[PDB]
Amino acid sequence: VAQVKVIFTTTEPDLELPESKRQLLVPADIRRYGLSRILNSESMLDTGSIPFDFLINGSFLRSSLEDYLTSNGLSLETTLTLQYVRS
Amino acid sequence: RPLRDYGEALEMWSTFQTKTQALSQSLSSQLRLILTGSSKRAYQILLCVDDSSSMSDDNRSTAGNLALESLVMVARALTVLEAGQIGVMGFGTDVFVAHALTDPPFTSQDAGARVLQQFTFRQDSTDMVLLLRRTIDHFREARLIQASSGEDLWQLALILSDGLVQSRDHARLRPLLREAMEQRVMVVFIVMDDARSRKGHSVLELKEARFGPDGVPVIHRYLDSFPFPYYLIVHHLEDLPGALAALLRTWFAE
Ligand SMILES: [Mg+2]
């Protein structure tokens, strides 16, 4: 039940979060499927079921966040900036 | 390198001391009324600095720099206490004693730089439960040493940290915080929340997502379960002297 700190960002116009909702602790074993559900949720974008992809530093997220950290030599102390894009 | 370059630490101590001199004077003038004049008391203060890599510039955080600036401000303010001993601990995956309560005072820039040398903000975890266990044990043995020849000894731990611990630990910290209060150790958490870091990135707005039994995400504010009874939020260094004095005035003294 370890957590990772993420910051959501987007370059798409109609899909910004208020500044107060962009920083989130999430379960470390989450993948893009779960992150997309969070973003669509009532307290976040409240858009229901848009499938989102996520870029980290210009590269698409293809694993859990903890495996992304391990693959890059990073610990759970790292804040990840997740850019969300419509799938 | 496990240490900062000593020259870099000297420059940092000198720069920070000049930057914070008026703030230290304001804090020490307030501490003089709270802690002095007016029994024959003694004070032991442990400044506990977070050495984890969430603090670090490589993580695009300014928390480490703000903590070391705060350390210099507070350490310098405290050296006006005749009957006070100041020690420093660093913590992340493990806890180290950077400066013992018995070591030379911070009246010297070389002693301050030797402390700053030890903070590099690279540790891979932030083990606050171990920090509290070690702090209580450290003060208990200092209390035993106190027995030697009649002391009204008061013990204070000031934790300088971005305050980011695994949410699970919030519960595990509560029994240790009771133990500290039962042993009359006052614990103040000084949350580094630098306002110039970026637009819109304060710990006050940090949320956390949990998935419910139904699978629906539920989102809470991270700080709602933060367990520490006495804590301050530091957006700018200018925030620290009055807030730290107010807490001690009210609840160290009472
Ligand atoms: Mg940390």
Residue numbers in the entry:
A (entry chain B): 12 to 98
B (entry chain A): 4698 to 4735, 4776 to 4886, 4890 to 4994
Which lines from the publication concern this structure?
One of these energy-consuming enzymes is the conserved huge AAA+-type ATPase Rea1 (also known as Mdn1), which is composed of a hexameric AAA+-ATPase domain, followed by a long tail consisting of an α-helical linker region, a flexible aspartate/glutamate (D/E)-rich domain and a C-terminal metal-ion-dependent adhesion site (MIDAS) homologous to the inserted (I) domain within the α-subunits (αI) of integrins that mediate ligand recognition. In this study, we report crystal structures of the Chaetomium thermophilum (Ct) Rea1-MIDAS, both alone and in complex with its pre-ribosomal substrates, the CtYtm1- or CtRsa4-UBL domains.
Next, we aimed to structurally investigate the complex between CtRea1-MIDAS and its two ligands, the ubiquitin-like domains (UBL) of CtRsa4 and CtYtm1. Since this loop (deletion of amino acids 4734–4773 in CtRea1, or 4657–4696 in ScRea1) is dispensable for MIDAS–Rsa4 interaction, we replaced it with a short Gly-Ser-Gly linker. Using these trimmed constructs, we were able to reconstitute the complexes CtRea1-MIDAS∆loop–CtRsa4-UBL and CtRea1-MIDAS∆loop–CtYtm1-UBL, which readily crystallized, allowing us to solve their crystal structures at 1.89 and 1.84 Å, respectively. However, one unforeseen major structural re-arrangement concerns the Rea1-specific element III, which in the apo structure forms a loop that crawls along helices α1 and α9 and was not fully resolved, but in the ligand-bound form becomes re-arranged, the short helix α8 partially unfolds and forms a β-hairpin that provides an additional binding site for the UBL domains of Rsa4 and Ytm1. To assess the functional relevance of the Rea1-MIDAS β-hairpin–UBL interactions, we performed genetic interaction studies with Rsa4 and Ytm1. The combination of the rea1 Y4859 > A/R I4871 > A/R constructs with mutant alleles of either Rsa4 (rsa4-1) or Ytm1 (ytm1 S78L)25,38 yielded cells, which were no longer viable.
